[PDB]
Design a protein around this ligand. Structure first.
Ligand code: K
Ligand code: K
Ligand code: K
Ligand code: K
Ligand code: K
Ligand code: K
Ligand code: K
Ligand code: K
Ligand code: K
Ligand code: K
Ligand code: K
Ligand code: K
Ligand code: K
Ligand code: K
Ligand code: K
Ligand code: K
Ligand code: K
Ligand code: K
Ligand code: K
Ligand code: K
Ligand code: K
Ligand code: K
Ligand code: K
Ligand code: K
Ligand code: K
Ligand code: K
Ligand code: K
Ligand code: K
Ligand code: K
Ligand code: K
Ligand code: K
Ligand code: K
Ligand code: K
Ligand code: K
Ligand code: K
Ligand code: K
Ligand code: K
Ligand code: K
Ligand code: K
Ligand code: K
Ligand code: K
Ligand code: K
Ligand code: K
Ligand code: K
Ligand code: K
Ligand code: K
Ligand code: K
Ligand code: K
Ligand code: K
Ligand code: K
Ligand code: K
Ligand code: K
Ligand code: K
Ligand code: K
Ligand code: K
Ligand code: K
Ligand code: MG
Ligand code: MG
Ligand code: MG
Ligand code: MG
Ligand code: MG
Ligand code: MG
Ligand code: MG
Ligand code: MG
Ligand code: MG
Ligand code: MG
Ligand code: MG
Ligand code: MG
Ligand code: MG
Ligand code: MG
Ligand code: MG
Ligand code: MG
Ligand code: MG
Ligand code: MG
Ligand code: MG
Ligand code: MG
Ligand code: MG
Ligand code: MG
Ligand code: MG
Ligand code: MG
Ligand code: MG
Ligand code: MG
Ligand code: MG
Ligand code: MG
Ligand code: MG
Ligand code: MG
Ligand code: MG
Ligand code: MG
Ligand code: MG
Ligand code: MG
Ligand code: MG
Ligand code: MG
Ligand code: MG
Ligand code: MG
Ligand code: MG
Ligand code: MG
Ligand code: MG
Ligand code: MG
Ligand code: MG
Ligand code: MG
Ligand code: MG
Ligand code: MG
Ligand code: MG
Ligand code: MG
Ligand code: MG
Ligand code: MG
Ligand code: MG
Ligand code: MG
Ligand code: MG
Ligand code: MG
Ligand code: MG
Ligand code: MG
Ligand code: MG
Ligand code: MG
Ligand code: MG
Ligand code: MG
Ligand code: MG
Ligand code: MG
Ligand code: MG
Ligand code: MG
Ligand code: MG
Ligand code: MG
Ligand code: MG
Ligand code: MG
Ligand code: MG
Ligand code: MG
Ligand code: MG
Ligand code: MG
Ligand code: MG
Ligand code: MG
Ligand code: MG
Ligand code: MG
Ligand code: MG
Ligand code: MG
Ligand code: MG
Ligand code: MG
Ligand code: MG
Ligand code: MG
Ligand code: MG
Ligand code: MG
Ligand code: MG
Ligand code: MG
Ligand code: MG
Ligand code: MG
Ligand code: MG
Ligand code: MG
Ligand code: MG
Ligand code: MG
Ligand code: MG
Ligand code: MG
Ligand code: MG
Ligand code: MG
Ligand code: MG
Ligand code: MG
Ligand code: MG
Ligand code: MG
Ligand code: MG
Ligand code: MG
Ligand code: MG
Ligand code: MG
Ligand code: MG
Ligand code: MG
Ligand code: MG
Ligand code: MG
Ligand code: MG
Ligand code: MG
Ligand code: MG
Ligand code: MG
Ligand code: MG
Ligand code: MG
Ligand code: MG
Ligand code: MG
Ligand code: MG
Ligand code: MG
Ligand code: MG
Ligand code: MG
Ligand code: MG
Ligand code: MG
Ligand code: MG
Ligand code: MG
Ligand code: MG
Lengths: 56, 118
RNA sequence: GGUUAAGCGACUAAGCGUACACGGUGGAUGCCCUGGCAGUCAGAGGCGAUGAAGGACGUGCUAAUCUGCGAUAAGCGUCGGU
RNA sequence: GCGAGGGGAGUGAAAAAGAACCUGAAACCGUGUACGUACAAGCAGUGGGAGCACAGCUGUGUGACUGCGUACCUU
RNA sequence: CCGAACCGACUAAUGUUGAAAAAUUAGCGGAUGACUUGUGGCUGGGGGUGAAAGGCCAAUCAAACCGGGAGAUAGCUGGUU
RNA sequence: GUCGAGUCGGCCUGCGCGGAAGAUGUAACGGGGCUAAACCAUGCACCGAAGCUGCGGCAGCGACGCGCGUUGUUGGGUAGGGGAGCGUUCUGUAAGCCUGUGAAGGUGUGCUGUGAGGCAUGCUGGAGGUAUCAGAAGUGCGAAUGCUGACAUAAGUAACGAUAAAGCGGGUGAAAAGCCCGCUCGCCGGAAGACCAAGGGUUCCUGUCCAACGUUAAUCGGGGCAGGGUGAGUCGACCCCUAAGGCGAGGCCGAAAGGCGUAGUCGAUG
RNA sequence: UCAGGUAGAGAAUACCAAGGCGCUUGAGAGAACUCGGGUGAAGGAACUAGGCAAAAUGGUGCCGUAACUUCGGGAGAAGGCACGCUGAUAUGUAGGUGAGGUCCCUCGCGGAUGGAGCUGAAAUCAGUCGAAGAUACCAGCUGGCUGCAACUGUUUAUUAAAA
RNA sequence: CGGGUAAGUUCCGACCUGCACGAAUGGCGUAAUGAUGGCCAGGCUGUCUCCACCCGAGACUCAGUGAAAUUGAACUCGCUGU
RNA sequence: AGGUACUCCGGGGAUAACAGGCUGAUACCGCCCAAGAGUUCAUAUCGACGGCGGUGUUUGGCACCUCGAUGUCGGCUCAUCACAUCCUGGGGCUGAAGUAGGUCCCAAGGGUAUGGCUGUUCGCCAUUUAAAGUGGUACGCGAGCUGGGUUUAGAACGUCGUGAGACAGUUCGGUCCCUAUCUGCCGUGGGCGCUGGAGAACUGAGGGGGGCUGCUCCUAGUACGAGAGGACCGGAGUGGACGCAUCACUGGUGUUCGGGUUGUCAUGCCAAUGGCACUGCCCGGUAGCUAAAUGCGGAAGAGAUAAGUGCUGAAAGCAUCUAAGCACGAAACUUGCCCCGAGAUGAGUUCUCCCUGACUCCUUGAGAGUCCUGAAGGAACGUUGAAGACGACGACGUUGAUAGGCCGGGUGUGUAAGCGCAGCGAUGCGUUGAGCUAACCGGUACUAAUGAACCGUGAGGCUUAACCU
């Protein structure tokens, strides 16, 4: 099965109207190190909820 | 449908799954913290924490059960000589999972899992 | 003034269209000729056992290819030109 | 990243002549602005036409609503 | 005679822009013989070879491939700014 | 017998009734609806076409007068015939004319003719262009399942090549599921191990790099770059010897080319 | 060309050795549907062109085996029984192998005797565990009537293997 | 016509009315053989009544890479008619 | 002079085979006349000789569409419509006693066999059923499956031919491609709208689903009938097929639970265990899913009717169901039952909740901007679910049982290991219904569900009524 007519650039854009990405609503701030981080994830320096959970 | 069913298939067959978690349980007992995918970490809790519960009562029969389930005498010894006593007064929840972003190679969601008194 | 009621009613654009502006891609067009095409007038009409045509391998201060050359190897002698 | 790529500086008459290099069309793909578009049925225009924006009543862009309207070639 | 290697190719499913321009998987036949295989040789296109299917002769066969006669011819179809 | 004013059935004729069941959905007025908004007859209005008229304009043909005027009339067109033109490249006119005070080309805008078209000019461009009147043609493209290049669509879709299988710690690194080291797990084991011939030809080892190649990433590679590496009286080839077969002095045969073959000479798979 | 171990008749097959690998996209999820597999109540070919596919049979020893026949066959016809482990017979048997010793010699890599040590089926009796002892992998379905071709072979490389 | 089946256009055994057999382009038989054609039975079963559940690989979601046939142009509904 | 099915090229829908179209001779179905049959009697039922139509269903005619391709017969799967009705429902006439029939009218709600043979469609046969309807839909349905038949290349028979070959004669064998752009359809989301915002509960325009029926018993051996036989009407029970839900029971599955066991490799060995062999092979089985399991459904009732039956009643002093007026009448229609449903743009209703700042500029208006403010609520993230492809939907987030673990129980398997005793030993027995036990049940903050941040604003147009101020 294949198209009988070439779809338009307009129809291509309409299909892609649901493809846009969503930015992260907001980042969280660690209460001890002050780092920003994804909520419920550890920070880049290894803090979570104010505690040094892992080295490096 | 999977109504009320438990356990993750993890795109493996049953013998692969069993062997994988036997190895991963050994790594967690040996190193006390490991990094893995978030779903594997959640499944590992149901393997490792009953091994620690078993190790609270030291007997020949229990050491043999633990050996049957880990196949590693260094792991069995650490379970009964160290972890059992460390957790003797804790009622479950010997591990904690900490989410840590996404793997570079395949964007897999990753997590650390560690013993709670590490 | 307020309240209620009835009637009417703009400001939405996920995206899409047309127009314009500015870009990307792409290599048309114009301009260009150490390449071709067709002739005219002349020349020469062969080369080879004194080893040809055509090649292989070498040859530099040289790693490669082109050009030249042949273990005397981008060259040797001599006579002229410059 | 002792990258790729880029921004400056400098050369030059010129660097949107920077080697992916004269000119740099079209298809095709974008960003910005103006207007239209989420109760509306078909060759997508044409005749009529409100509103809005713009430049100086007119010119330009857009085109709600409405009459008419089934591509081209070949055979 | 039964059965691996080896040589085949009866059935089914898959695959059919394949993993593959003929295969894979499960079964299947022969398996000391008119057997199978390596290396080299010979037969040439109206010709070869053929336990014969017009089979095969380099993924090509009721007359191979390449070059030439060659711009064959086309009362046919298309196209003609 | 009662009862007291009409009754009966032919003919011809207008309009209607039954006869009358079909498949996606009313579905046999185009629809709404209509008792006229139906049908018949008569009449007067009006709507209605690119027909006719009015106004303006162009052209063909014929008259009539002096190319012009006047006049009448004509102007839908396929095949096809006839007539008249636009533009493109090149030659002369041209050692002229335009052009770095900006040519050709590109891209806009304005004006202009009945058309092909023409003219002017802003921006871009950065060195050519060419009037007029003649002359010559590779002289005009949307189609030929045309030819070449470029770029779309489907679509960020299918797929990423055997369902032997991975897990974790450490290292390096800009970055590690894939590389290195380690432990564990799994798979082949008449092979998925080891070694030759054939075929290939540097793919081998070391260092270095990650553009492209690798169906992902890549620090890794059979990828790029550089350097290194193949040592024989005994292994193999060459060599001696022959098979099938080939060639073949003379020779025999054949228009020519050539065919066959003797002495010989080659030819391993021995 | 090479050819280890345990089981095995075996170069089959299963698990391993030496040795070599996890197949150059991964991570989740656990819908329909497709592919490759497992199991299925009662029924059991009612399916369908056709039992296609699937299921089934499957080993060794012994007992036993019809028509027909070219006297070879048919035939593994069919059908059936036994099968693990332990002990005893027998501290390991029958058999195989064979040292010292002894004797002889035409004295050796010799003959004869002798048998220590090593290796080792199969059977019988008794006992014993399980639902199941050819336990996995592996491994014939069988019978009756009939057409055609005697037979083993050959063929349309790539839709026909057959008469 | 007989047999087999509850039921048999096939099968087996006959009959002879051979449309249109017939004797080496052989006739009629024939043990054995066949991945050969037809028919019947036992066993066996998800072939089926009539499907259910389960284990894996895809399909689905996320990240990376990234095709194809087709295509005059599309603002690409039903019905009844034309 | 022939053959080509071994075939080939250029062309044609200028021209056949399939399907469509036009046509309707033929076919099928109605009707008109009434010779007669029917003891009598044309019309209960048949209807000769002839006549008139309807359908588009057969066999055909034509050659208009398609030859730069519109795939065939049958089966399978899935259907949808017509009514000329097979069953069930309603009725008139009967040469209708009853039971059971014949014929015609109304009626399309639902229902409407399994097998043997054959490629069959069909048909015959066996046995069912209330019945086993007739047709249209490309003789519905191959971008849904099959491929037995027809219709390529191989081979043979009969037959024809000198032969190559040929035969809607026969016989054995013989490749079925497509990842869905658009329409359509089944599901499921995102956007904006509905005029301040928000959380809920609704109304019901409209749409869909459903609608089948047997047998037995009572009425009653009554009515009817000479007997044989044997009812209507009404009532009760129990089935078939179909549908919806569910998992308490009976079961299937149950590669995540327990056990038995073969071969082998390993953990040093014994003992005990693990890997691999289809889950190695097996025996059981929890939750979930599920049918064969077991609950429930089709209605009653109402309205308006069809054919049909009437009442009163003239036109037409009679008669007449009809013209005025009035009444009955069926599974069809509208409701009643179940589900969806306000994008019902005609965007509805009800309840509740939230927001009561300052200033500036301008082209001066439903204008723009800054500062302050940030509600109700939402979303996001996390732990998740008998919810789920993804979205969506539901629960929960420390003021907490959302998930995992943990504790206790249940269930399943069937007496672990170790030690001891008996036995030469395999093994048996005791400790011991032991040990282990998924998805289940009841509990429990041990682990993970973070303080925040984000979106959403700041009293909501004009006109006119009414009412109050
Ligand atoms: K917009
Ligand atoms: K372009
Ligand atoms: K050179
Ligand atoms: K330039
Ligand atoms: K460019
Ligand atoms: K219009
Ligand atoms: K054409
Ligand atoms: K034509
Ligand atoms: K040989
Ligand atoms: K030949
Ligand atoms: K060739
Ligand atoms: K030839
Ligand atoms: K005139
Ligand atoms: K211009
Ligand atoms: K210019
Ligand atoms: K073209
Ligand atoms: K794309
Ligand atoms: K590749
Ligand atoms: K990657
Ligand atoms: K094996
Ligand atoms: K999913
Ligand atoms: K012995
Ligand atoms: K066997
Ligand atoms: K014979
Ligand atoms: K064969
Ligand atoms: K003969
Ligand atoms: K004979
Ligand atoms: K055969
Ligand atoms: K046979
Ligand atoms: K001929
Ligand atoms: K033939
Ligand atoms: K007719
Ligand atoms: K007609
Ligand atoms: K009629
Ligand atoms: K055709
Ligand atoms: K039908
Ligand atoms: K009836
Ligand atoms: K009746
Ligand atoms: K009906
Ligand atoms: K049949
Ligand atoms: K028939
Ligand atoms: K058709
Ligand atoms: K098909
Ligand atoms: K068909
Ligand atoms: K189609
Ligand atoms: K469409
Ligand atoms: K209905
Ligand atoms: K149950
Ligand atoms: K169950
Ligand atoms: K074992
Ligand atoms: K009356
Ligand atoms: K609403
Ligand atoms: K819990
Ligand atoms: K016990
Ligand atoms: K015990
Ligand atoms: K128990
Ligand atoms: Mg088309
Ligand atoms: Mg998208
Ligand atoms: Mg749960
Ligand atoms: Mg995956
Ligand atoms: Mg396994
Ligand atoms: Mg835009
Ligand atoms: Mg740079
Ligand atoms: Mg220049
Ligand atoms: Mg340039
Ligand atoms: Mg461009
Ligand atoms: Mg509407
Ligand atoms: Mg609107
Ligand atoms: Mg539309
Ligand atoms: Mg119109
Ligand atoms: Mg062959
Ligand atoms: Mg095979
Ligand atoms: Mg044989
Ligand atoms: Mg054999
Ligand atoms: Mg020739
Ligand atoms: Mg032939
Ligand atoms: Mg070939
Ligand atoms: Mg020829
Ligand atoms: Mg010629
Ligand atoms: Mg030609
Ligand atoms: Mg009439
Ligand atoms: Mg209708
Ligand atoms: Mg007019
Ligand atoms: Mg006119
Ligand atoms: Mg005029
Ligand atoms: Mg005219
Ligand atoms: Mg004209
Ligand atoms: Mg000139
Ligand atoms: Mg020029
Ligand atoms: Mg000139
Ligand atoms: Mg030209
Ligand atoms: Mg062009
Ligand atoms: Mg043209
Ligand atoms: Mg094409
Ligand atoms: Mg393309
Ligand atoms: Mg992507
Ligand atoms: Mg798609
Ligand atoms: Mg997809
Ligand atoms: Mg995919
Ligand atoms: Mg791969
Ligand atoms: Mg790592
Ligand atoms: Mg990997
Ligand atoms: Mg190289
Ligand atoms: Mg290397
Ligand atoms: Mg290197
Ligand atoms: Mg790459
Ligand atoms: Mg990179
Ligand atoms: Mg390298
Ligand atoms: Mg390299
Ligand atoms: Mg010779
Ligand atoms: Mg000679
Ligand atoms: Mg010789
Ligand atoms: Mg020699
Ligand atoms: Mg040799
Ligand atoms: Mg071996
Ligand atoms: Mg093997
Ligand atoms: Mg899923
Ligand atoms: Mg699955
Ligand atoms: Mg399946
Ligand atoms: Mg099975
Ligand atoms: Mg069963
Ligand atoms: Mg069972
Ligand atoms: Mg059973
Ligand atoms: Mg049975
Ligand atoms: Mg049958
Ligand atoms: Mg059947
Ligand atoms: Mg079979
Ligand atoms: Mg089987
Ligand atoms: Mg045997
Ligand atoms: Mg020996
Ligand atoms: Mg026969
Ligand atoms: Mg034979
Ligand atoms: Mg073939
Ligand atoms: Mg074959
Ligand atoms: Mg008979
Ligand atoms: Mg019979
Ligand atoms: Mg017979
Ligand atoms: Mg004969
Ligand atoms: Mg004859
Ligand atoms: Mg004779
Ligand atoms: Mg004869
Ligand atoms: Mg004869
Ligand atoms: Mg014969
Ligand atoms: Mg044979
Ligand atoms: Mg993707
Ligand atoms: Mg033939
Ligand atoms: Mg042709
Ligand atoms: Mg026709
Ligand atoms: Mg017809
Ligand atoms: Mg025609
Ligand atoms: Mg005609
Ligand atoms: Mg047509
Ligand atoms: Mg076409
Ligand atoms: Mg078609
Ligand atoms: Mg009717
Ligand atoms: Mg109806
Ligand atoms: Mg009803
Ligand atoms: Mg049968
Ligand atoms: Mg049959
Ligand atoms: Mg059909
Ligand atoms: Mg039909
Ligand atoms: Mg179709
Ligand atoms: Mg298909
Ligand atoms: Mg067939
Ligand atoms: Mg065959
Ligand atoms: Mg198909
Ligand atoms: Mg919505
Ligand atoms: Mg309905
Ligand atoms: Mg339950
Ligand atoms: Mg059970
Ligand atoms: Mg089971
Ligand atoms: Mg042991
Ligand atoms: Mg192993
Ligand atoms: Mg293995
Ligand atoms: Mg009712
Ligand atoms: Mg009266
Ligand atoms: Mg009923
Ligand atoms: Mg949902
Ligand atoms: Mg119990
Ligand atoms: Mg045990
Ligand atoms: Mg418990």
């Amino acid at each position: 099965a294949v198209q009988q007519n070439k779809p338009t650039r307009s129809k291509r854009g309409m299909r892609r109207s649901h493809d846009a990405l969503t930015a992260v609503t907001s980042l969280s701030v660690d209460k001890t190190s002050g780092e920003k981080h994804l909520r419920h994830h550890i920070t880049a320096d290894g803090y979570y909820r104010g505690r040094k959970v892992i080295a490096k | 449908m999977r109504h009320r069913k438990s356990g993750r298939q993890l795109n493996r067959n049953s013998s692969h799954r069993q062997a994988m978690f036997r190895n991963m349980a050994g790594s967690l007992v040996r190193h006390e913290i490991i990094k893995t995918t978030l779903p594997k970490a959640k499944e590992l809790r149901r393997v490792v924490e009953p091994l620690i519960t078993l190790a609270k009562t030291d007997s020949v029969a229990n050491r043999r059960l633990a050996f049957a389930r880990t196949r590693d005498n260094e792991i069995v010894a650490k379970l009964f000589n160290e972890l059992g006593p460390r957790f003797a007064s804790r009622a479950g929840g010997y591990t904690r999972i900490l989410k840590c972003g996404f793997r570079a190679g395949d964007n897999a969601p990753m997590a650390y899992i560690e013993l709670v008194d590490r």
